[PDB]
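Consortium newsletter contribution from the modelling node. Members have asked for a concrete example of what our holo predictions look like. Here is one, prepared for the adenosine-5'-diphosphate complex that several groups have been discussing at recent meetings.
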Amino acid sequence: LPPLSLLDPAEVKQKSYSPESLEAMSRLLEIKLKEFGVEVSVDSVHPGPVITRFEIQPAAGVKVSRISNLAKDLARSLAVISVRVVEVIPGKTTVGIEIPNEDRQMVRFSEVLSSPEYDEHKSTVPLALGHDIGGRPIITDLAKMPHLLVAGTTGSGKSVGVNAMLLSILFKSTPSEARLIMIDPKMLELSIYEGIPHLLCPVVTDMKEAANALRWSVAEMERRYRLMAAMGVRNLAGFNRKVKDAEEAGTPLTDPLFRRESPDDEPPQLSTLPTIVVVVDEFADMMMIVGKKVEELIARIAQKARAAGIHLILATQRPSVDVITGLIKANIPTRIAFQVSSKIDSRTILDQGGAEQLLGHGDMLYLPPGTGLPIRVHGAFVSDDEVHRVVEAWKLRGAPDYIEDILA
Amino acid sequence: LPPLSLLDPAEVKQKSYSPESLEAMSRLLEIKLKEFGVEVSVDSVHPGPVITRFEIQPAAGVKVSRISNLAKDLARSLAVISVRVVEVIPGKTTVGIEIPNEDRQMVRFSEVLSSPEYDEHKSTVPLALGHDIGGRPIITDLAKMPHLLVAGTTGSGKSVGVNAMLLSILFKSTPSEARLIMIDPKMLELSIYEGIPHLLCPVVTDMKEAANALRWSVAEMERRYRLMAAMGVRNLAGFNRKVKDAEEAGTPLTDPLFRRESPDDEPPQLSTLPTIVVVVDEFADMMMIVGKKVEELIARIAQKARAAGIHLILATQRPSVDVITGLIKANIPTRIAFQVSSKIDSRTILDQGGAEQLLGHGDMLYLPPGTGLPIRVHGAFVSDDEVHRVVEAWKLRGAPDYIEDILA
Ligand SMILES: Nc1ncnc2c1ncn2[C@@H]1O[C@H](COP(=O)(O)OP(=O)(O)O)[C@@H](O)[C@H]1O
Ligand SMILES: Nc1ncnc2c1ncn2[C@@H]1O[C@H](COP(=O)(O)OP(=O)(O)O)[C@@H](O)[C@H]1O
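And here is the predicted structure:
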């Protein structure tokens, strides 16, 4: 299993904003808001790697909308590219304003995977997103999402974030614990992972083949459910316990779904199944080339795949109603949104405005399932070298075990 | 390779606005805005070839929208045809107002290609657009766009701008470095280039044939990808290095995609491939005459053509939702917009208003991919003589090497 040593080190964090600096900006904020309609006062300051949040306490009678409404102008008066108004801060009666730091200090992938949360993570498919507005590492579980929709226009840092996602898997799981199906409608982005042992087939470039890989996944999903039913198990996890225990008890289990066709035929022995992850780099391109069936397959996978251990990672730079459709969205409750062109775009992916206010370069809004405000996360940066490195590391540890069956 | 000597010389730049004149206009601006609601003060003045930008500092509490909102009236009070309000000036807290100079000084094509940016440009397909609002040359790379959408109503200077684009290629590349497919639904504009050696076929006039040219392009694209795969190369550039090195090392490469059909058949030797550029003068006409297939073909080309070295230049005077559609826009992120009839039209091409505020005669808004405000560019003027001249210069340097295969 490749060492975190392959990752570039955390660059000198030349941070720290003198108590005086922060206090100065605080008064400035107050002044500027005062110059416009609202009278408010800073309640507390929380600096971070990319932005600094100023929780302000609105004067009597002032409505939050008034603050949100002049985020464009406030930003200008402060000479910052944009400012993010967080209308509600749980438990407090304050509102928050996140202003971009003059010097954004970078977040290195190694700086995230080094956390104990990622280290002690028990999932086969953990996703280290980056740091929250306060510098703390945000580690998630793809298997609990249990599918992911990713959107971001060019320049937002979406591609890097996807690499961060893939590397999160590759730094924690072996091919027998997690397998991948990579669809790259543009022989660009994912082609750099060709050959790693986790791949179930080559990086899919032909869209017709990609459609088959999706069909294959539905079948593999159905087969697993059939298997688990016979085993008296509820999901891949339980299936794997059953099979492991059996092996630790010298009495290995045998495929219950085996059908004898000859007196010779012998039931093959069961082995642990890997968590399957299907990532489509630009699913709007797959939809465009192939048609309505891509959407239908996605919906079918996403509505039932969880318990079987098959998970979807769908990314696009075209967050429109035509691409992120009702069918696609239906059972993919978890959304990550990097910077997008407009509130409209933001709503398409997050069903809520905001992503348009992101700063680019990995700044994102992570929205897990259920009510709850999206979590702002400053994506970790991972270079093509760090990726190229981890790939070679894995190519050494094993050759590509393809199932040509899948793409046909 | 034709000499830049064929281009008319830069006419006497009788510019210079006395420090007093500029200071007078500054106070005038202040006064007029004051006569209306807003109170502002000029922070700095930046004169240019076509307009002069006055960075103003809005008084406490005044919102940019108020300024933008009375650009129509301010223009009248200033006796200028229109005024452009730039709501955000990176890093500063000022707003900008671009007023048309009384005497617009022209920008000659020679005055642009003379720049070091164009001279030292390493691309086979550079595009010298013109001068920015400050008189500086704007040189771009079609290959990095990697496709271009151009819109402008009659009188905006779109035709001249396209000629400027074509001449940018013709002044830097030979037929073996760059080839062209010209579709002219109106046997008008592009017919003046007939015969130049770069043409892969005659200037396409029949739309049915044009459709085939597009089909041919998809095929050529597919073939190149197949080629590059076999070569272990990522794109046309890498392909050409491989083949060039081979030649410089006396051991030339041979077509890996060659299939022997006879013991005689011998693998043809590989030669460097040209960057292909397909320009459609009025793609709204092609769509009208041919149908849904034009759009589908465009989308197919634009979604994958980059790495293979094939690039699209699509222009139209009809920037409507029916023409610049989602399919077309899908993978053509780079947009150039000359003056258009309305904000609606502007949004159709730029997904943003503004192009309606342009001054005509080559005034444009160049929008490269990603976030970022469009770059206003005063397009260089190129006469029919300068074009006629560069054509003849090339017709002498070589005869038209057509591939009749393409149009059928
Ligand atoms: N997390 C990050 N931190 C700092 N810079 C980043 C980060 N993610 C991306 N970038 C910068 O942005 C550029 C573009 O990122 P990329 O992921 O390729 O964007 P997209 O594919 O969405 O256009 C990179 O070249 C890199 O310098
Ligand atoms: N860059 C430019 N600078 C100065 N004048 C220009 C420029 N581009 C065009 N013009 C003027 O505008 C006229 C129309 O330009 P043209 O490109 O044919 O417009 P369109 O085809 O969009 O109607 C030309 O006859 C020329 O005098």
